């Protein structure tokens, strides 16, 4: 089982360094080359900052999966679990408000001129960080340490009282407002964009909606794909673990650690996907 944790620490590190260099590159072009007056510019910038802090807490989780012992401490684990928690909900909420902003800009191009604004986008991001701190209340007030008989110690969220009630209650709490609601909003917003582009194409009669709709449909397809592949298996694994007791297996540990790197890889590829494949960003860079 030594080569299993070795290759796991390896994939945890390469996804971290590609996240540090990748996100710092996006921040460098946004602050220096690009301007901070564009609404979608500060959105990717806020997403890059949330991705940067998410990658900074990854070495703490990478060291936890390397060796079972956690020699860091208690207060240091409390703050890194909050950082990892506040960055996950922020990046999820940033994707939601970005899909809504794209939905308002395409479906309602007239009302969006007065709805969204640089001052309004700052209030939206401030509200995103506000609700993200509100959904991580149990993570901050129920964090602790767990000791083992072999001398090992693992830092995780502990729920007082009888078991089987707070565990399944929290796993459905983060599944609805973290996976269910954000995905359906993004899916409905992206679907309305396709209908709006298709409606605008058949009304103008320019006969150029073929290449335009195909590029947007491909962009929406790859976005939803990498979102599902790195969030759906990770969530169903948590629900299946808290609903029925599963025996400890090194294959299950490797599979659980694998879907986490995919989640970090999605948070790593999301800023570079909105930047590299973009037209205005590539022209500035």
């Amino acid at each position: 089982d030594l080569t299993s944790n070795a290759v796991l620490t390896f994939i945890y590190f390469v996804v971290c360094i590609i996240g540090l260099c990748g996100n710092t590159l996006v921040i460098y072009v946004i602050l220096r080359y690009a301007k901070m007056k564009t609404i979608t510019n500060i959105y990717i910038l806020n997403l890059a900052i949330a991705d940067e802090l998410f990658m900074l807490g990854l070495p703490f989780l990478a060291m936890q999966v390397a060796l079972v012992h956690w020699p860091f401490g208690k207060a240091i684990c409390r703050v890194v679990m909050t950082v990892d928690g506040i960055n996950q909900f922020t990046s999820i909420f940033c994707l939601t408000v970005m899909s809504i902003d794209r939905y308002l800009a395409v479906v309602h191009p007239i009302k969006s001129a007065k709805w969204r604004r640089p001052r309004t986008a700052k209030m939206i991001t401030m509200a995103v960080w506000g609700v993200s701190l509100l959904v991580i209340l149990p993570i901050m007030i129920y964090a602790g340490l767990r000791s083992n008989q072999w001398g090992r110690s693992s830092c995780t969220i502990n729920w007082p009282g009888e078991s089987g009630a707070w565990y399944t209650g929290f796993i459905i709490y983060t599944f609805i407002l973290g996976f269910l609601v954000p995905l359906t909003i993004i899916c409905l917003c992206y679907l309305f964009i396709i209908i709006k582009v298709k409606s605008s194409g058949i009304r103008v009669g320019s006969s150029k909606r073929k290449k335009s709709e195909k590029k947007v449909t491909r962009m929406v397809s790859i976005v939803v794909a990498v979102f599902i592949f790195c969030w759906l298996p990770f969530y169903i694994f948590n629900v299946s673990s808290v609903s029925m007791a599963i025996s400890p297996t090194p294959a299950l540990k490797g599979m659980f650690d694998f879907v986490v790197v995919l989640t970090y890889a999605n948070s790593c590829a999301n800023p570079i996907l909105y930047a590299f494949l973009s037209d205005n960003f590539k022209k500035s860079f």
Binding site: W150, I157, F237, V242
Partner: peptide
Amino acid sequence: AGCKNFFWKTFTSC
């Protein structure tokens, strides 16, 4: 207590 195998992101043995 409970001693869950995998709950959010950690591996807690029993």
